Amino acid sequence: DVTRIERIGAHSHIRGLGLDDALEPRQASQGMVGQLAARRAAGVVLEMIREGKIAGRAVLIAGQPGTGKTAIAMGMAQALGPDTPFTAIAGSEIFSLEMSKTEALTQAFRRSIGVRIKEETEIIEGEVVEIQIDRPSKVGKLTLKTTEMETIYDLGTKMIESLTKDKVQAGDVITIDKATGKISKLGRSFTRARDYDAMGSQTKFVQCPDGELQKRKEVVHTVSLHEIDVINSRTQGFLALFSGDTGEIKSEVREQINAKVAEWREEGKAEIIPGVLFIDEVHMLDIESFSFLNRALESDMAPVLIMATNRGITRIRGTSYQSPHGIPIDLLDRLLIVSTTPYSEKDTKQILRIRCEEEDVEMSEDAYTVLTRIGLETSLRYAIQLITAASLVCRKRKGTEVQVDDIKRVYSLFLDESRSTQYMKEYQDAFLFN
Amino acid sequence: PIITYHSVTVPARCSRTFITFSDDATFEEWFPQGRPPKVPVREVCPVTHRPALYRDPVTDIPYATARAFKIIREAYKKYITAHGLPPTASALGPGPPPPEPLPGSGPR
């Protein structure tokens, strides 16, 4: 029960790359199995990302379909963690009507660079022991305490306004920003009076603050360069962060922002956290897009670029020419290529074992053997998809384990590409527009 | 000054509000209280009864229909003299079937 928004997806079982401390891959770890050389290369690329010295390095993951290119990408994403950016898109997403392809790629590049802004603040945090306001110009008095000390404050007018709008009252625990007088209420330490009718929410309690009433603390805020661009693009441009009306941000704004971020870096305010941009199925990009990427990768603010494609010698979109991977050789020279090999019998079996664990499915060894042979014969993804169907078939007969007969049942019910194509060729007159 | 708030928490550990209006006269203009009439008088037409409709005319008393209005305006010409016969004793057939007998239509 309690189905959260994240359910079991295609790559949910992947939680890392399964590498040793020396980047040497384990045969099965963190949901990944097989692809030793590609996983090792991805670990090296992940270390390059972590150090962050070198800008604009590009990597291509290549191989046949079903060989775990996207799996290696999500493994890098999970191993990298949430603190560092990881922007993932498909190549088809840049073809917007709101903006040009170059603008879309510029936004995607700048989404993947983080700015770790840091500043000092002073707060007053304490349990409200007493408050008084002599409204007739208004005057008042406030008292706050911690476990250590107590202090009475004679209030100014605007502080009284903020207190009244927030309806602060005694027994509350609050935090007051010394710089601007903003108040934030953390909870209550004392119950409200039970004599009062109808205002009887039970709520929950919070401990008294400790130590000094007034403290100075460091605070860190993380924003992307694209957020800074959109905020500074126009008046009330922050709405475009959610609506997406960021149409063709002017370049002068970006130059000013880069200079200000650099001088913040020298002045100790900010740290640059360069992340990763991942473009799955990059063969959808046009020749213009690759030409733009050639120069976009030469900036010092460029992130690490990762791409995934399966094509052999294949046409470049927007042209009549052909090249390896559907990518021009202007860009292929600028990048390192990672090759994924097809899986063996044991690796397929281990992938199916790991997938059954993720889906909470128990199957016999004969069932595993049969499904492994099916996956070798047709495809890995088809064999993975049959697991849930076979489990449902077992469940409706009130079984406890998925048996070979359930697998053959769903194999009969649901068809793969080869059989469907064969049967389509039998009904070739009935099907349309051959 | 009316002192919009005063909270002390002192007793179980608690939290209260003690509004102190001061100035005497400030109290009642913040608490006038009320004593309205809970319901009105349910009005009935003198002519053929049923609940009243529209309002009174420019003078006199409410009515239900245009026929009742016509009889009421044919009435009150018998009374502006301030003397004469009964202006309303079964005047102009003012809905006369008595399941329970009717007085004259002179409530004004």
Added chain:
Amino acid sequence: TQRIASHSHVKGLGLDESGLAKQAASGLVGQENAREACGVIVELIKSKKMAGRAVLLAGPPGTGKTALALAIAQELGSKVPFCPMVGSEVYSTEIKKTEVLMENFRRAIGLRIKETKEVYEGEVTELTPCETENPMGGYGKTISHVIIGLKTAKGTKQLKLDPSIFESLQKERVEAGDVIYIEANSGAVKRQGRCDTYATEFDLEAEEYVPLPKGDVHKKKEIIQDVTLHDLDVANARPQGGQDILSMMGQLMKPKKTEITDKLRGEINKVVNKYIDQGIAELVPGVLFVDEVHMLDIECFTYLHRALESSIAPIVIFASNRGNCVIRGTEDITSPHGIPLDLLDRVMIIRTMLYTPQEMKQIIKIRAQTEGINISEEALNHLGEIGTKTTLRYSVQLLTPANLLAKINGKDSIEKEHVEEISELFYDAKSSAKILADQQ
């Protein structure tokens, strides 16, 4: 009566308790293997464990593959979302193609928000302040409570409220005889009007003499509302606050669709997960049905590669009738079903078969029953022969004109002569195409 559509006779998959398919049940006949597979798919959807698993319904035209998808909707009921779309709908003038798909992916995920509140309401009668003279110091007169008496229908009760309510109380401008609304957690007063007891042949007020409420003075209200994730995205993307000038400026300039960013999707997923954890919301993942999927471009399919791999995604059902056809957006690339092989590896294919003459006759009888038509046996057999010769759908279309023709002739049922006349007044595609050689 309600209007009769093509698939109005479909009410379900007609499966046994064991999941096996009855030969004729719930308005469907035949397609037993496909219907059993659809049974497995509805179980998959009801399990709610899976995200992004996809299904392709493949077969010749007229084999009811559209009906099976609608039968899946009937089995799931109205709780589970079911979003139908055509492949040709992605080509919008306002937003890119991949945004249209993601909008429909989010429309298929539902959310039931079950927020609760407890309140007090009725006719105010007191406006009575309490008094304790002094706040333990130099003093004028101190109240320390405010007595508020409510009566609505069931009874009367007095509430000794916090003194702080008094500011809000004359801010709402309440007096005796008014009727109000106060929420328990906040204590926020709201004036609804004044009772109908001061009404009934008074009238003439825009506030409306709102009637004296029914029920108890104290109420606990449990509101359940169904909403999709796309609705949350659209609502949170806009500045709906009327107090800003740009909001009312939005009235005059056109409110076009916009390309919603992934940041908003992530934040809405975060707050939805928080609601689910705290118990205010329940997730209802649903179905997206993309009929005529062959109309999509190669860009759309290549985006669906990523979209179906998401852990957030719904169950997707595709339908196509094409053979080995050229993929749209490519120059010369042929593939089965007009779909790339790379996406075709990501789906489970449900095949649909051509119908026998007996199945055609049975479907024709079902449609005649659905349309309120009485047909004789020989007329039904001749119509089945026509459907065998030309097409099932064409023969099904002849029922209503023939019934109208019989009604014009005073008869209450279709005989063979009426279908014979209708088959010469109207032509099928094949017969007309043969005629096109004659009339060039």
